[PDB]
Amino acid sequence: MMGMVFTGLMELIEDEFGYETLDTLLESCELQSEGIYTSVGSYDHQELLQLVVKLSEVSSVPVTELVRLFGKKLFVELIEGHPEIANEMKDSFDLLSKIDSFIHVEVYKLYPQAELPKFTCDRLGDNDIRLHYQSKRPFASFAEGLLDGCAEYFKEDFTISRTPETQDSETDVIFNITRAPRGAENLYFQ
Numbered sequence: 001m002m003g004m005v006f007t008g009l010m011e012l013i014e015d016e017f018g019y020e021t022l023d024t025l026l027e028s029c030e031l032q033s034e035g036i037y038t039s040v041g042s043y044d045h046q047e048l049l050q051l052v053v054k055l056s057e058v059s060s061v062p063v064t065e066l067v068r069l070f071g072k073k074l075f076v077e078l079i080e081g082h083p084e085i086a087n088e089m090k091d092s093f094d095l096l097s098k099i100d101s102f103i104h105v106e107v108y109k110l111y112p113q114a115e116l117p118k119f120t121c122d123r124l125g126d127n128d129i130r131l132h133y134q135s136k137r138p139f140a141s142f143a144e145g146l147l148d149g150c151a152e153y154f155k156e157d158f159t160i161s162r163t164p165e166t167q168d169s170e171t172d173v174i175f176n177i178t179r180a181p182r183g184a185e186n187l188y189f190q
């Protein structure tokens, strides 16, 4: 949803940086009518990168710290945004189970402009989960922002890691998600 992420971007720059700063951003892309068309249109990916680059120059904000804050705000926007989308879900682990089975099936059927990659889930056990992600445009900071944001609304603490074998390789990325020890504090026995 390129239209929906545009709405999220306008709210974030105006509220935390200013309206004058917000005005400079709208000049880099340039308006045409008002600026807020609501979520219903789809723009290119270069459109997203062009405003992102202006952010690193107009406010001097790093592209990695900006991508982290961005993921947190938009994800919690969808949670309170759709009560039946969070009602059907029962937990974060269950989220991974139908993250593409039904959540991205409704999105895909709705508008065909969106394009998604491939996702395969392997389950090593109860505290071990592996996710395979095949895409030619893999940004780890982007995916982590979305998974941790989810654990932000639920209020939890999971750890998302990565493996160094494909750590610096595109197309194939291996992620390891584990549950950090919690619940009292049992190291082992005594």
Ligand code: HEM
Binding pocket: 001, 002, 078, 085, 099, 103, 104, 107, 113, 114, 115, 116, 117, 135, 137, 143, 146, 147, 150
């Ligand atoms: C944290 C949970 C979810 C994960 C892990 C996830 C992740 C992703 C990823 C990785 C993509 C595309 C990334 C890329 O190709 O660069 C994507 C795009 C998208 N997701 Fe999700 N998604 C999740 C939940 C949701 C939810 C809740 C919905 C909304 C009901 C949803 C709707 C979409 C849409 C509309 C796109 C397409 C955006 C675009 O085309 O640029 N996602 N999702």
